[PDB]
Design a binder for this molecule. Structure first.
Ligand SMILES: CCN1/C(=C/C2C(=O)C(/C=C3/N(CC)c4ccccc4C3(C)C)C2=O)C(C)(C)c2ccccc21
Ligand code: NI
Ligand code: NI
Ligand code: NI
Ligand code: NI
Lengths: 98, 101
């Protein structure tokens, strides 16, 4: 579901800017590497995908290039915390056995 | 945000049905327990969520005896496929991140 791809993409992006400030191609590469070629990145598509995040306010663009914002780190710390809880809830359902 | 909560709610409900066919009261009980009390779902929320999932052929429903006659919900063939996919692709994302160290 295209809905759920873009979800998965954004998280890869953000986890890259997390590790350091990076630019289009330097991101693609790092993903290519880390995916083990597995992640066919797309030069045409990272436009729209990076506007909506600066537009939302989680990402900044300075000239040499992108950085993770005050907000940004929060909205992940949130998401990673809440989804981790969900993992534990799912373990306990497997443990409830029902 | 609202979008994410309802998403997280969709996952927990589907994982509930994965561990076995189940009815509304049973699900909410089993979710209260699993969430140590943090998570208490109302019938009405559930019904609207299940309404879309039946309508997209993800789950379906049937009557079963015992109590009295209850409405049971089950993961459909397609349901099972989507969770496998979801779980697989998400497990990939997880390792990729790791290889950003
Ligand atoms: C992180 C943001 N995110 C989401 C994240 C996650 C996520 O993480 C996740 C499922 C996981 N699973 C599947 C059980 C596992 C399993 C083991 C370790 C970690 C995970 C994670 C990655 C948390 C999932 O779905 C989803 C649901 C796609 C989502 C929808 C809409 C907007 C954002 C968003
Ligand atoms: Ni930053
Ligand atoms: Ni930083
Ligand atoms: Ni089945
Ligand atoms: Ni089944």
């Amino acid at each position: 579901p295209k809905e759920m791809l873009r979800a998965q993409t954004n998280v890869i992006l953000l986890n890259v800017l997390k590790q350091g400030d990076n630019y289009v191609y330097g991101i693609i590469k790092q993903v290519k590497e880390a995916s083990n070629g597995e992640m066919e990145l797309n030069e045409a598509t990272l436009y729209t995908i990076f506007d909506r995040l600066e537009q939302d306010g989680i990402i900044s663009s300075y000239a040499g290039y992108y950085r993770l914002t005050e907000i940004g780190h929060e909205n992940m710390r949130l998401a990673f915390e809440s989804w981790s809880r969900v993992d534990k809830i799912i373990e306990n359902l497997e443990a409830n056995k029902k």
